[PDB]
Amino acid sequence: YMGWWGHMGSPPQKGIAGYTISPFAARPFAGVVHAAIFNTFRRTKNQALFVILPVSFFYYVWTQASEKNEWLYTKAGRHELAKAL
Amino acid sequence: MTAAEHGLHPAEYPWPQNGMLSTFDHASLRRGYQVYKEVCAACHSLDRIAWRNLVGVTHTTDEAKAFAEELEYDDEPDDEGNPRKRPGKLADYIPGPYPNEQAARAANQGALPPDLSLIAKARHGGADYIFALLTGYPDEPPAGVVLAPGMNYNPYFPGGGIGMARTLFDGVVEYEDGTPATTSQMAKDVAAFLTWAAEPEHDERKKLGLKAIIVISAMLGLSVYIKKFKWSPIKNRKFIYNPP
Amino acid sequence: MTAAEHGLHPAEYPWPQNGMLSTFDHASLRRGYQVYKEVCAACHSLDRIAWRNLVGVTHTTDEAKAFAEELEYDDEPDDEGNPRKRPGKLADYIPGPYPNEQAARAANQGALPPDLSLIAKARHGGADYIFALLTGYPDEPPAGVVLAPGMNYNPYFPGGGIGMARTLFDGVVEYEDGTPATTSQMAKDVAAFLTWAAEPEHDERKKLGLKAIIVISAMLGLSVYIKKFKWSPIKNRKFIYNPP
Amino acid sequence: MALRKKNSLLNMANSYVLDSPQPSNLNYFWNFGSLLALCLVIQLATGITLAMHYTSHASLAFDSVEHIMRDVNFGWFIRYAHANTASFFFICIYAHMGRNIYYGSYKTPRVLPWSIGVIIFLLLIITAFMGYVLVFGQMSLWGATVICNLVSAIPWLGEDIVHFLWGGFSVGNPTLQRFFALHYLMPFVLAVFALLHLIALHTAGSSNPLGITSNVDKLSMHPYYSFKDLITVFAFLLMFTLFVFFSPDKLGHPDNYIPANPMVTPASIVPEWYLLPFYAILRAIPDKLGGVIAMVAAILILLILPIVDRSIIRGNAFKPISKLLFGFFICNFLLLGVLGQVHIEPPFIVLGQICTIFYFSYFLILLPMVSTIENIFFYIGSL
Amino acid sequence: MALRKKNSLLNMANSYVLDSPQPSNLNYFWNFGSLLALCLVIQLATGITLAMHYTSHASLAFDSVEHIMRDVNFGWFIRYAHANTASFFFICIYAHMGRNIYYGSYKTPRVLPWSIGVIIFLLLIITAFMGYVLVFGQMSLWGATVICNLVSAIPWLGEDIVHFLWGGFSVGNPTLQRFFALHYLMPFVLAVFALLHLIALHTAGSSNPLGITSNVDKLSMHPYYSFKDLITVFAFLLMFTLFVFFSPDKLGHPDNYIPANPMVTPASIVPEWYLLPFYAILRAIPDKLGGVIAMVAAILILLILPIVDRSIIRGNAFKPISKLLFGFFICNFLLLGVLGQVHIEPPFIVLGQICTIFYFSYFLILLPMVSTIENIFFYIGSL
Amino acid sequence: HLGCVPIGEAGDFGGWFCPCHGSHYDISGRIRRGPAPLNLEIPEYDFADAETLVI
Numbered sequence A: 001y002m003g004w005w006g007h008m009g010s011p012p013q014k015g016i017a018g019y020t021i022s023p024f025a026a027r028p029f030a031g032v033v034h035a036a037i038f039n040t041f042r043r044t045k046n047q048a049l050f051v052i053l054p055v056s057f058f059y060y061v062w063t064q065a066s067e068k069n070e071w072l073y074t075k076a077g078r079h080e081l082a083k084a085l
Numbered sequence B, C: 001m002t003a004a005e006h007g008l009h010p011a012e013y014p015w016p017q018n019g020m021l022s023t024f025d026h027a028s029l030r031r032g033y034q035v036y037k038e039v040c041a042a043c044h045s046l047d048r049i050a051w052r053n054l055v056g057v058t059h060t061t062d063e064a065k066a067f068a069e070e071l072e073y074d075d076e077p078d079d080e081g082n083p084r085k086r087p088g089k090l091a092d093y094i095p096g097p098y099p100n101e102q103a104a105r106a107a108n109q110g111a112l113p114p115d116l117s118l119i120a121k122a123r124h125g126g127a128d129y130i131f132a133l134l135t136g137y138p139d140e141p142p143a144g145v146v147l148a149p150g151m152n153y154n155p156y157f158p159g160g161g162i163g164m165a166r167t168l169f170d171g172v173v174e175y176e177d178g179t180p181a182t183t184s185q186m187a188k189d190v191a192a193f194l195t196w197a198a199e200p201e202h203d204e205r206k207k208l209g210l211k212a213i214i215v216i217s218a219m220l221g222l223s224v225y226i227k228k229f230k231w232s233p234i235k236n237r238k239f240i241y242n243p244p
Numbered sequence D, E: 001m002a003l004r005k006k007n008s009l010l011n012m013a014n015s016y017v018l019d020s021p022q023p024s025n026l027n028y029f030w031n032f033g034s035l036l037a038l039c040l041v042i043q044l045a046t047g048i049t050l051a052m053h054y055t056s057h058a059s060l061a062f063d064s065v066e067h068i069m070r071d072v073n074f075g076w077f078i079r080y081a082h083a084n085t086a087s088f089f090f091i092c093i094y095a096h097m098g099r100n101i102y103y104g105s106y107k108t109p110r111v112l113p114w115s116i117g118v119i120i121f122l123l124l125i126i127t128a129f130m131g132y133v134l135v136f137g138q139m140s141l142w143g144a145t146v147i148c149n150l151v152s153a154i155p156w157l158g159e160d161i162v163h164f165l166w167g168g169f170s171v172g173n174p175t176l177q178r179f180f181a182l183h184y185l186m187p188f189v190l191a192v193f194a195l196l197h198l199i200a201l202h203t204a205g206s207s208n209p210l211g212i213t214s215n216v217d218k219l220s221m222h223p224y225y226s227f228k229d230l231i232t233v234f235a236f237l238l239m240f241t242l243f244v245f246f247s248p249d250k251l252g253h254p255d256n257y258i259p260a261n262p263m264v265t266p267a268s269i270v271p272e273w274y275l276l277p278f279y280a281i282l283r284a285i286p287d288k289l290g291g292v293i294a295m296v297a298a299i300l301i302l303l304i305l306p307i308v309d310r311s312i313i314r315g316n317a318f319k320p321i322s323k324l325l326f327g328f329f330i331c332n333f334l335l336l337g338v339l340g341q342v343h344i345e346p347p348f349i350v351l352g353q354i355c356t357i358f359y360f361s362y363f364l365i366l367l368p369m370v371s372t373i374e375n376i377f378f379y380i381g382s383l
Numbered sequence F: 001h002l003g004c005v006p007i008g009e010a011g012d013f014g015g016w017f018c019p020c021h022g023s024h025y026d027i028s029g030r031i032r033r034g035p036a037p038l039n040l041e042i043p044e045y046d047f048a049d050a051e052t053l054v055i
Ligand code: HEC
Pocket: B035, B036, B039, B040, B041, B042, B043, B044, B108, B111, B112, B113, B114, B116, B119, B123, B130, B133, B134, B157, B161, B162, B163, B164, B165, B167, B168, B190
């Protein structure tokens, strides 16, 4: 499923003209400030829910479990600990 | 587990060596050696440290040779194969108070005082734990605690009952630099000294780390410029499609 | 080099163990242990051999336990950490006559008697060299030889002057099996025993080697048949050429 | 013809590092492969150097490590580099495997590099476990004891196998000397399998974040990915520097600075952090043999991803529900890690069981269901 | 298409061991390559097993070898197998190199496999030398001392390099521990170079005893050469058996059963037999640096055989004068071996110098002259 | 010569006599008779005190 240069396995290409300029002719950091602020914000905003939802859920589960565990091993939690074992 | 079974967590004290760019205070290291030698060394060994290790850290070559030369160490047997002793040399290790574990336990009501050469790395908390433990013996155990015989209450020690009694009291040591030897001062110095004993490369390591951080950061910045420079023909590529 | 600098080469004696299929004579091994124990062990150690090693080779479990139990070995310290002794066990190594090299040399006019556990492998000649050396002290050194002080003439020893005097004389040992203990008999037995001490796997090794030789030979023969069988179409190939 | 193409030896290197045709759109998560190669090179260089100073005998092992720290020039650095790079190796391998799962790198035609990859991961675990024993501190000994006793669960012959592994009746000198020899060997085996998974990959080439063919638009590996790899190399070296020089023991257990003592048992015997999720899975099953099987199955179940993913599309870039499920699976894997080092107490016992069920149900239920439904939504939604 | 051809991993094995097209007329001297592979496999298996029981610390090394002989189950066999197979490895490598020189395997187009082969031979020497030191008997120590002091001849920095190699001011514990680590590593490096010389060879294929192309008449490697290799494998195993089980110490030095003692010097310090010709060459030159250069040149001069052989025909099968010269060269090499272990006394001092001149003049004078004249005799003689 | 240790006080120049091939060293440890080519090498030594030398 992959060939090599000259016979890579692409379907026939026709009709596309491609253009580019030399690395010495270009400014490598052109538009960097716009990218760093606006592009990153767009990309991050669109992925935020997929990170926030599972992270917030599993952090909450952990927080509840760790606080209960802590409370069961205090004096106040003696009775509830006895039942839990 | 109950908090008592864990032990109370020591405070974070501001040690001189805390700080990416900070060395030990060597004057504190020297004073801490003196607390080790006059208090701890009665029960605790420091077996990983040789006299040469003190030289240019806490002591000059001559001071350390003098400490070594006051002791006797086992020599090679004489010509009839009978045992002999020699005076100590800089290559010799600092000798411990007891010949074996059994002797150590017999002198400490069954408890074995650990070797202190790695203790700052072998306990959670490091210098802070050593400082907290040495200064944290309350006059009276909290009401209701029943100590086993030969145990002392110390909240920092897991379970609360430690076989080591309080040993640092105001003026047990007379420092040679005129520093007031209060319990807190002695605990701070000896904790610093023990931290040095556990990690004697500390000062050099952090300086080499500063050099590495600087070089690696500059190389990271330049590698970004170079990657962007080389990639710009691909990033900037444009197409015109005319469907055949 | 002079022949004297090399030492005279020992004869090839017909040992029972010479022979692809031959074990040691275990009765000779047992007698040789008794010569070791009563003569050699005054100056020479056998440190690589434990009491358990004798069991089922020269002695029963009970005999070897009895030899071990007659000796005292260092135990772990007692509860006050003071040294203690225990009786020997089968796991213990046979103890040597001297505490260190310096003591050994002092007892032997400066010479150090080697440990005998590997001596049969550590000398050209093996059992033959040990036999030749022990039986090869002439009554008088050849005219003109000047021995250094504390040296004895023995032609098998390189240079001729050995620090070990003759030790085997008719009837120094009384064998427990009634064998006449002549110099030659004792030398033969102790050389056999020392050969066993150097290579205790000898008997098993040669029997496993017999099994391997047989299997490998059969496999070699069959591999020839199979190679010829598979190659015959290539070997038998014929051509008719008609030039185009 | 250029020499790099004509000469067969040069041409092999050329095919992998220079003319190798890559997709033009690999993102930074395709950089973990070269980071893993870097970790392997660092571990070989530091590990062989430590072997020049380390003594495998139980009477001297722990002290030989202290001699390395104290007397050998730069020994502290070589030791800390080796110990920290073991953690970095696992961070990079989890990242590389997470990349592979998110982007569908396990799907045809890349089942073979993925399946060999799962064996690489097993070899890394064994390698790291044996290396940790070599210090012969308290965690070294007690970790070896409890992990090697899991083999006792194998029916009939289990106890015999354990005594055979130990070379005696408990973890001791024979076990330490054999772990040294195997710890030295296993990285070479690991390098061979790493090479095998790349040769297997070379038939399809790298996948790419869009999940489509890149046969339409290829870039040479060099100079593009060479220079893009340098960025993450220097980022990695910055993280390496912060741990090795400024916090060398942050990732370790203080008990490993106490010499092994078969009499005293440490308060809590846990594996190194990177093994913790598998330990939580084992705890979840009450049966000994059950637990061992579950723990092994948790790794071998990666082999069925090619089957249980029923999607007609490779990778998650365009699959919102699959991306949510993947997010939950990853966070659950981190929670399992945390639960691997808590005490066996309420309420973490039940929580560990629920997380274990979630872990397995991802492979067996959720991914097959979600991938089926998304197939239908793509078809109907675009009609 | 058959799976062995279609799958890229299987196809690599297939290309080397199964469908690999071989000349149909290889004689039994083409069997040393597979014997060398067998020796390498035995040395890896026995060596890794010895490493599980050996302790590299100078206070325990010699005794750990005695523990292997005495206490480890079958330890005597594993130790004797490892020590004897080191000698067999050199017998097979000299046979393989002799085959290559007689049949012109170094000529185009096989210069690259031959040149990598010369490095394989250097790595085998280093590997074997370091392994011999590990016993830490008298020959171990004194051989290490004398051989490592040859580096002192390097001008300006030589002494510093020696102290750096030793890790101190004499051969001692630091040297032994580093030799252990390098002795374990070097066989893996050797296996890689062995693989490289085969991949380089695969472009031309094996040469054959007639020296002509075999492209006209090929046979699959399997089953023909597989079954022909079994014959020499079983012949080798018979020789192995006779030494390992019936005469395990015939090839060794008794002084290596005495523990290293830096005070007492052994009567004669010689290398293992397979290094003896190179030691005779070194003794022949009176200058220290001269001697070291000559000794290294004696191996590196193999790299010029492709140039100094001016024959238009590959190999010696049809060249009576070249066959006589080759016979003298081989016997001279064996005499150099013998002279490597005699005492430095008359008349062996001068004899060693004459044999050394003959050794070098084969490459520099005789083979270029004889191969030139035989070219003319073939042309004129067949007109 | 080869590298045995000479027995001191013995000899013929009453310094050191190597028993191996019979080479005689002097009270300076100079070679006088026998196969040995050179005088016994001198290490690098300094008198730190008048009662102790370091080598
Ligand atoms: C006369 C006895 C004695 C003196 C003096 C002494 N110790 Fe100890 N120390 C012990 C004993 C006994 C233990 C073991 C206690 C136990 O395990 O219950 C111990 C334990 C410790 C521990 C380890 C506690 C732990 O977490 O395991 C540290 C740290 C310590 N000592 C430091 C010091 C320092 C620092 C000094 C003095 C400056 C000191 N000790 C003086 C007897 C002593």
